[PDB]
């Protein structure tokens, strides 16, 4: 039961972090519970109540994968499944994959030269960094594609037009899209991080239950 800002637990190839990186922007608390974490997947939940700092993310409690880092151009597949639900959707928050890449394979793993997000859900109109630049079709499904930047990190967010509580896909289809359509430098960027979780702004109490998350990088 993980309540502290960087409380964490690792089982198998999964690492679950409470990751209350934004806690000083508001008032409240958040605890993350690990149900299972094995070679094959992980199940966990996080319960939070946040107020204040309404335009600032308070946290990104998440499960992250331990994998062999490699150039995005050398990746064949990133198969993943995510099944989740929120008990309370009267909130301002999003549910998302978060991936970082860097030119340095030893970059710090909480940021990148690039970031790729895949938002399975958003509540209350909260939005990714930047602006919508395209509607992208990936594996036969449409995504709003956002692009933003903070002057070091450049972030592409693929946003689901409606909530996807049971997702199965290959994240490498998204990297391929970026490489082929947006000049993403796949041959000089290492994939360094692959996480799935939720980013709350305000609301609660609310509980994200992740009944299963799996991924691999081949
Ligand atoms: O700002 C540092 C903080 O970033 C977190 O990642 C952010 C990302 O920077 C942002 O572009 C995106 O919209 O949301 C993610 C998730 O909140 C990261 O999780 C932290 O560990 C890091 O301290």
* CATH superfamily of the domain spanning 1-218: Glycoside hydrolase family 11/12, catalytic domain (2.60.120.180)
* Rounded Cα–Cα distance for residues 127 and 150 (Å): 15
Mention every residue, 6+ apart, whose C-beta is less than 8 A from residue 168: 80, 81
User: Which sign, positive or negative, has the C-alpha torsion 200, 85, 169, 191?
Assistant: positive
Quoted resolution (Å) = 1.7
**Nearest CA residue ID for atom 5, ligand 1:** 110
Of 59, 60, 37, 34, nearest to 45 by C-alpha is 34
Domain ranges in the chain are 1-218
Tell me if the bond preceding 163 is cis, omega within 30° of 0.
Answer: no
Q: Is the CB of 18 under 6 A from ligand 1?
A: no
Retrieve residue 186's tokens: 């796949």
* Cα distance between residue 70 and residue 89, in whole Å: 37
Q: What is the Å distance from ligand 1's center to 22 Cα?
A: 9
Could you tell me where the beta strands, DSSP code E, fall in 6-78? Answer: 8-11, 14-17, 27-37, 42-51, 61-65
Q: Distance (Å, rounded) from C-alpha 118 to C-alpha 157?
A: 6
DSSP 110: T
Strand bridging mode 61-65 / 42-51: unpaired
98 lines ligand 1 (CB under 6 A): yes
Q: Which method, experimentally, gave rise to this model? A: X-ray
CA distance 103 to 156: 17
The 8-class DSSP code of residue 71 comes to B
Q: What are the backbone dihedrals phi and psi of residue 167, each rounded to the nearest 5 degrees, phi first?
A: -110, 135
Q: Taking the alpha carbons of 94, 97, 98, 102 in that order, is the dihedral positive or negative?
A: negative
CB distance 20 to ligand 1 below 6 Å? no
Alpha-carbon distance of 21 to 36, in angstroms, equals 24
């Amino acid at each position: 039961q993980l309540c502290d800002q960087y409380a964490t637990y690792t089982g198998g190839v999964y690492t679950i972090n409470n990751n209350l990186w934004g806690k000083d922007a508001g008032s409240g608390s958040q605890c993350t519970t690990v149900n299972s974490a094995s070679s094959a997947g992980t199940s966990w939940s996080t319960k939070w109540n946040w107020s204040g700092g309404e335009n600032s993310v308070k946290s990104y409690a998440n499960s992250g994968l331990t994998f062999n880092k490699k150039l995005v151009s050398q990746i064949s597949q990133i198969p993943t499944t995510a099944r989740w639900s929120y008990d309370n959707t009267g909130i301002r928050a999003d549910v998302a994959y978060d991936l970082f890449t860097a030119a340095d394979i030893n970059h710090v793993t909480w940021s990148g030269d690039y970031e790729l997000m895949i938002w399975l859900a958003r509540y209350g109109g909260v939005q990714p960094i930047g602006s919508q630049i395209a509607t992208a079709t990936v594996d036969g499904q449409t995504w709003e594609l956002w692009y933003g930047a903070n002057g070091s990190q450049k972030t592409y967010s693929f946003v689901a037009p409606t909530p996807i509580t049971s997702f199965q896909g290959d994240v490498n289809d998204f990297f391929k899209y970026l490489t082929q359509n947006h000049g993403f430098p796949a041959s000089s960027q290492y994939l360094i991080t692959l996480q799935f979780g939720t980013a709350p702004f305000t609301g609660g109490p609310a509980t994200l239950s992740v009944s299963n998350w799996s991924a691999s990088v081949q």
